[PDB]
């Protein structure tokens, strides 16, 4: 909590009573000469540190914040819906442990929920010997969700699915369901961060929220505090300069997708996370309509005398294609 990192890539002092170590770095960013007063080791560390942040999108301090045009790039193939090329990828041979993880998620997307779990079991036993901390914790966090998917699936095919389909399809063998019930039977996800070593606990605190359900409840409440405001100004004829409150959501929206895709997590396919995208993109496409229609005296267009017009780009189509049922899309057509 020493600093605060705004959504826009800007950073502001929060709890520093000592040297502004963040500030010197950005002072080292622009100073090419000072970048030359380092040893090659130290220079490479800066390069390892510099290459990380630009990929993390951190730009410069708030005091010198200029016109920031943050980029967005989703590269996960599943987000790109290339269901055929992955059907060859899963056929390929494994090279590394990180590659095995990448395949495991790809298996799930194709509906072959059966073999996914076993390789989720196959990766877990071989994981420790390389002493890579992360690759274990997310392998189980992914397991219990695709566990629940099987469990919630098997009842549904029994309860209603017979009416929906007319036959009692059985996608999962009897014996397989037994083992997963046994292995996870008393599994309480809460302690899982409370289990991993102190060595794990000091480096990888930032992965904590994915354990309980506070991660999905944490993000949503802000969208309720962000949405409650914007409708208020919509009924006030107000004008907001600079970054409008709606622009805050979009960065937050795309930030969530990237972290929840490229790490290959499996929470994308659940109903709750779909709830987040529905009420986020609804607010953005809602806000577009009000801008296109309102009055101004003289200075109204003098304030931000242009707009994004919600120029709906390619990813935005990819977003609305998945996450909305037919009924949900109709609700927006009306207003």
């Amino acid at each position: 909590y020493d600093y605060h990192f705004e959504v826009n890539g800007t950073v502001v002092r929060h709890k520093n009573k000592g040297f502004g170590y963040m500030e010197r770095f950005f002072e080292l960013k622009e100073s090419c000469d000072e970048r030359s007063k380092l040893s090659k080791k130290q220079y490479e560390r800066f390069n390892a540190l510099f290459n990380f942040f630009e990929k993390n999108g951190v730009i410069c301090m708030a005091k010198d914040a200029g016109t920031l045009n943050t980029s967005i790039e989703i590269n996960s193939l599943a987000y790109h819906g290339k269901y055929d090329v992955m059907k060859k990828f899963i056929e390929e041979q494994s090279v590394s442990i990180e590659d095995d993880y990448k395949k495991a998620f790809f298996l799930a997307c194709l509906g072959r929920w059966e073999e996914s779990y076993d390789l989720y079991s196959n990766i877990i036993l071989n994981s420790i010997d390389e002493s890579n901390g992360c690759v274990y914790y997310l392998s189980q966090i992914n397991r219990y969700r695709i566990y629940q998917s099987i469990t919630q699936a098997v009842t549904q095919f029994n309860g209603l699915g017979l009416l929906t389909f007319g036959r009692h399809y059985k996608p999962f063998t009897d014996e397989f369901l037994a083992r997963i019930e046994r292995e996870m039977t008393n599994f309480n996800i809460d302690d899982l961060f409370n289990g991993m070593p102190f060595e794990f606990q000091k480096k990888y605190k930032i992965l904590e929220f994915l354990s309980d359900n506070q991660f999905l409840y944490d993000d949503t409440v802000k969208l309720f505090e962000l949405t409650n405001k914007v409708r208020s100004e919509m009924s006030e004829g107000s004008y907001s300069f600079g970054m409008s409150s709606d622009i805050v959501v979009l960065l937050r929206l795309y930030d969530n997708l990237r972290f929840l895709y490229e790490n290959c997590l499996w929470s994308v396919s659940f109903h709750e996370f779909h709830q987040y995208i529905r009420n986020s993109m609804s607010l953005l496409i809602e806000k577009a309509e009000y801008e296109r229609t309102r009055d101004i005296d003289e200075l109204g267009f003098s304030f931000f005398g242009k707009k994004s017009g919600f120029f709906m780009e390619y990813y935005d189509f990819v977003n609305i294609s998945r996450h909305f049922k037919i009924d949900d899309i109709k609700n927006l057509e009306r207003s």
């Binding site: 877990i124 036993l125 420790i128 189980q140 046994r182 292995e183 039977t185 008393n186 302690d191 899982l192 289990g195 991993m196 070593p197 102190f198 060595e199």
Partner: protein, 313 residues
């Protein structure tokens, strides 16, 4: 039986409080085609004299024979034979998962293998493995897996595993901190004994020692008897006097002599699924339970209706 009902109640109460610490013997390891100790003694004796001993190995012989082998042949043969006997991987069995299902904060293991370690790392509760006197200081997690007798991670050498008579005689200076931590853990938890015989003189004397210390402050540990022959009331009463509490699998179920796995699974399932409202019994046992949970809440004035889900689990 009411005795078994109380046994299950006390075990479940210990489990919910996270005060359950299992104790693992050779019974667990004999369910996963792991070659038994008597086979090891047989190998040593056969090399020593040219043939197996006839008749059951008396308890002293189990410690005396490898002493003879180490005296005569030397350390190298002992190490090589340990490598021949133990350098084999094996797959886990259901009983390991059931043992871990209790979420035991600690697990004592007198065996030599690492199968329990594979089970522990499979479920996902990190256990600070401790097997050498240097391990105690470096233990990370509060959860411990005390392989008291040593292990092979640092090598298949005869110094790392107590297997010769001097070891058990010299246990008091060889692995002392294991002794201290053993005594404290047994002092401050509810210990249960599974797959573990009645012939370990060292541990038997240890439990006797704890009892003579603690007097009436001794939370007696629990023993899960699993031989197909039902325990005898004479033996039951005698050991109850000795200060333990016995749980017999033969009373619960009926099976063949070689159906050890069924018995272990049946007992562990009786622990897992003894859910409890199942044993409410009579009418007037309803109210005292409800009074048991809701009565403390008479200090607060009024309650959110939905929140009652928590207090009723």
């Amino acid at each position: 039986d009411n005795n078994v009902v109380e046994c299950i109640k006390e075990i479940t109460e210990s489990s919910r409080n996270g005060k359950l610490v299992f104790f693992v013997g050779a019974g667990v390891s004999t369910l996963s085609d792991y070659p038994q100790w008597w086979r090891l003694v047989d190998k040593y004796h056969e090399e020593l004299y040219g043939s197996p001993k006839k008749g059951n190995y008396s308890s002293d012989e189990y410690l005396r024979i490898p002493q003879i082998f180490y005296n005569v042949k030397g350390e190298m043969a002992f190490d090589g034979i340990l490598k021949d006997f133990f350098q084999v991987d094996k797959p886990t069995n259901p009983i390991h998962d059931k043992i871990l299902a209790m979420n035991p904060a600690h697990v004592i293991t007198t065996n030599y293998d690492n199968l329990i370690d594979t089970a522990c790392w499979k479920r996902g509760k990190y256990f600070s493995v401790i097997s050498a006197e240097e391990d105690v200081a470096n233990a990370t997690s509060s959860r411990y897996l005390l392989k008291v007798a040593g292990d092979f991670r640092k090598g298949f050498k005869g110094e790392n595993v107590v297997l010769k008579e001097d070891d058990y005689l010299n246990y008091d200076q060889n692995y002392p901190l294991i002794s201290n931590l053993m005594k404290t853990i047994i002092a401050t938890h509810t210990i249960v004994f599974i797959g573990y015989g009645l012939g370990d003189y060292n541990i038997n004397m240890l439990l006797n020692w704890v009892r003579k210390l603690q007097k009436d402050s001794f939370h007696k540990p629990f023993f899960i008897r699993t031989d197909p022959s039902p325990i005898e009331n004479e033996t039951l009463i005698y050991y109850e006097n000795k200060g333990l509490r016995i749980i017999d699998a033969a009373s619960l179920i009926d099976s063949n002599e070689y159906d050890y796995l069924e018995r272990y699974s049946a007992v562990m399932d009786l622990l897992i699924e003894s859910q409890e409202n199942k044993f409410i019994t009579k009418d007037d046992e309803v109210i005292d339970y409800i009074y048991g949970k809701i009565s403390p809440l008479f200090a607060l004035q009024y309650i959110r209706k939905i929140d009652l889900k928590h207090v009723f689990e």
